[PDB]
Amino acid sequence: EFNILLATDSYKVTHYKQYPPNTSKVYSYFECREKKKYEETVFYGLQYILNKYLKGKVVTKEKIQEAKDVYKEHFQDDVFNEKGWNYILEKYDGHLPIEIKAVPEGFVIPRGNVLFTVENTDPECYWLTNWIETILVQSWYPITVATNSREQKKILAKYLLETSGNLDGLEYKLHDFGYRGVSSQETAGIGASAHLVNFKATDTVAGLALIKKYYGTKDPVPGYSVPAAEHSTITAWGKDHEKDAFEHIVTQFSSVPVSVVSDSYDIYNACEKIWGEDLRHLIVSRSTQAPLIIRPDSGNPLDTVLKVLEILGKKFPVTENSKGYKLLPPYLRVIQGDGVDINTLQEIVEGMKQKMWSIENIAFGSGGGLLQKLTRDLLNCSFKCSYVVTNGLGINVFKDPVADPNKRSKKGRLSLHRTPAGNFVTLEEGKGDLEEYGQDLLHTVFKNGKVTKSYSFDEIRKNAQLNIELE
Amino acid sequence: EFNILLATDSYKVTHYKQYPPNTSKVYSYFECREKVKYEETVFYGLQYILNKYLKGKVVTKEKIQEAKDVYKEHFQDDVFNEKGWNYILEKYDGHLPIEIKAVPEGFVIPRGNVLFTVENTDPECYWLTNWIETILVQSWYPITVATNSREQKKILAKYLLETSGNLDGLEYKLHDFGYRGVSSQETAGIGASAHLVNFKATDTVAGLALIKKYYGTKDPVPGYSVPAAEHSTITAWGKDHEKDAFEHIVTQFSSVPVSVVSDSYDIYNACEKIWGEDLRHLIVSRSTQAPLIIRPDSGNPLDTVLKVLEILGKKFPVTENSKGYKLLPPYLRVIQGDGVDINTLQEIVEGMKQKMWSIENIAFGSGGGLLQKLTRDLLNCSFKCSYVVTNGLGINVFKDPVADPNKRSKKGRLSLHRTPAGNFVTLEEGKGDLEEYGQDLLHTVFKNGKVTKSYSFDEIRKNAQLNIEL
């Protein structure tokens, strides 16, 4: 079972001995620090952490003794704050005397703004605020995935609109294939849920269970998939029977959309000769609601996409849409699910536009690129102490390393506000109290062991909408 | 609760309908596919996956109905194989009819070799082999962490040996600070455990519990830490009181080693004036077993390390060791815990060598670089089908994409062997049965819901040692 006393960085165990004596309050904040592009971030994921790990009775006699035993060996010394944890157990029935205030989930906030703050609600628990830094800071991951997914949605929307005149199907143009490429089952659920903030296309099922348990949607599920082959379901038929495999699978799934990986031996032969001649009759008869979706999976992603399109365009009846771009017949589409990250996504749609192919023809699958190839320094997600009270006097505190101005942290009590032009500003030094900038956008979401405000996944999606979607 | 019927890629739900009719066997393997870096990998972490997710009764009526209801909405259609999963429930009491063979954990094997194989033990369950690809393939992460961690140990060993004449303290020279920088609690435990295959220094507490539960050590714990400050324990004292913070912390931890972050405002001032002058008397009185470990945390990592060392070497009594390199007194050390990954680690130690500083002086902390900035394509970890039986006839199967030879997979029944020169070779096409290469080095580790062979964390560590350690 999860033990909050064993869910921190080891050195934090020793910090209760290092703060200034007579310190009654430690107040800390999280930002995605600005760096001298990712100019705005989606706040998403805190609610999951609050519910799974921080709420309710998280301290027990047994958990205290377990931690004491572990730390005695780990440190080869007794340095553990057994008294402090006992106090929380006795006074608060093991609920954390902590208050967390946060921007609403799904909100899209420029870099360098406070997104949440943390403080102890009992003077004895000054040490507790930063104890939970480690667990709260992991919110960087759903924030970063949601943000990066949204940034790719902006690219897709831009090119789709330019090449087609609309945004139909935008929410299915980036399909999560990342389940096998992430570091764990838990990460898979979290990351998949973050992508779903922006899109509805996914193969990472763990996402759906997380959303149902922690957020909830009006619809039965937040995300969807369609039948698709993998290489094993093609190669199992034998090298000489790729066509038999193709035929069997599109016939099995004749009335729904079906993706068929086509590069097992020779992607270009498969498109030109197998799909384009041998089995053409099984493709052109298909419904508009059930296209064949041809899937290349190797080679340079842009070059292979263009070559596949060029091949298919000469074997199938292509039209020119009202924008002047080429469109495959409705029963035939393509998905590129290899080598896709935000960078190659951009290169591919731009290459397509250059060769006069509509973005309507294509969708993208991304796995590692989407859910794994991201770190905490992408958005400089960071948690810092900005305010303490020592001997009954509050002091504004911060770091400001001489060699790196980018690492300077904010000072004092913080609040988030709308600017007169409708943007965001973070007020420092408790200046929000002057009430010159309207209401604080942070809300209490956790206080003394209870989750005090929650958002549905539907609200989060609404908050995270693109401007182009609003317009 | 965890539901293995909901722990696969969506499309695999539809694959039982896509295999050739009358397929009775699907056999698949995992390798770190070959492409000058990462020529060999540490096999680690499958044991965790077998135990936490695959073993025992993993199928119930409840789980089957839950999967049915989710998939009906997820596909907007009924395509889920209720019957196949019920068959497993009713025939095998929900235990998976699967056999898995694997190289021993901790083993170091060149790229391009079979590391584990998977096959169904019941003909009705031909579809099960690749259903669990997704979960098994996540072994890439502990493999990749362990491997990249060990490569860093190699660098440290080489430089420590050259600048000091020995390897004392090697296993404490790379310290896991990645708890906050990974994507989840589960990842934290897995990744930290993997680092611990090579080192004993960690702040990622989650790793200890995983190791204790799934592997085991003779010693009470696999990894250790020491007291250390963070910016909040310095800055809370106020900008004008950095000295008071330093003095309090080192006095509180006077007889154990203590790391103190010294760059909150001005690292060079803190080293030269606060540590080097105002508080010097509190440092030079410390035990060899309880050094002050000064921690810079910003600026160019190499440049800052060198300047910190130059500063300290002028304020403190420096010796020259037997190899001719400079050594801080034993009560004073440095840890660089910012911007450290395998590339910058190499750059720092090489730069220290050029300025004649022993690697004895320093340790490194790595977080994101150690546990998060890694992907499945670093070692090309990959799971593929190589052998099927259909209509009673065994077929050797494979992919071979025209535009990418590096993605070609292996054919047929596989086995792993020692060569006459004592290296590893993977035999394809069932050629291991010809018995020209001696015994298959893979062992059966899972069969029909039971874990059938396992390794302690002490043995895994022994298997993973460096040559120079041997």
Residue numbers in the entry:
A (entry chain A): 8 to 43, 53 to 487
B (entry chain B): 8 to 42, 52 to 486
Q: Can you provide the manuscript's text about this entry?
A:
NAMPT functions as a homo-dimeric enzyme that catalyzes the rate limiting step in the primary salvage pathway for NAD synthesis, the transfer of a phosphoribosyl residue from 5-phosphoribosyl-1-pyrophosphate (PRPP) to nicotinamide (NAM) to produce nicotinamide mononucleotide (NMN). Crystal structures of NAMPT in numerous ligand-bound forms have been reported. These structures consistently display a NAMPT homo-dimer with two essentially identical active sites at the dimer interface. Typical NAMPT inhibitors were found to occupy the portion of active site responsible for NAM binding and a tunnel-shaped cavity extending from the NAM binding site. Furthermore, we determine the crystal structures of six NAMPT mutants in the apo form and in complex with various inhibitors and present a definitive model to explain the differential effects of the mutations on various structural classes of NAMPT inhibitors.
The crystal structures of G217 mutants revealed that they also perturbed inhibitor binding through a His191-mediated mechanism. Glycine is required for this position to allow a water molecule to bind and participate in the D219-H191-WAT-Y188 network. The addition of a Cβ atom in G217A occludes the water molecule and disrupts the hydrogen bond network. In addition, A217 pushes the H191 imidazole ring away from its normal orientation by 30°, rendering this part of the tunnel less compatible with GNE-618 binding. Similar to H191R, inhibitors with narrow and flexible linkers, including APO866, are less sensitive to the relatively subtle changes induced by the G217A and G217V mutations, which is also consistent with the modest drop in the biochemical potency of compounds 9-11. Compounds with a bulky phenyl group in the core (series A and compound 12) were less active on all G217 mutants, while compounds with a narrow more flexible linker (series B and compound 11) maintain much of their potency on the more conservative changes of G217A and G217V.
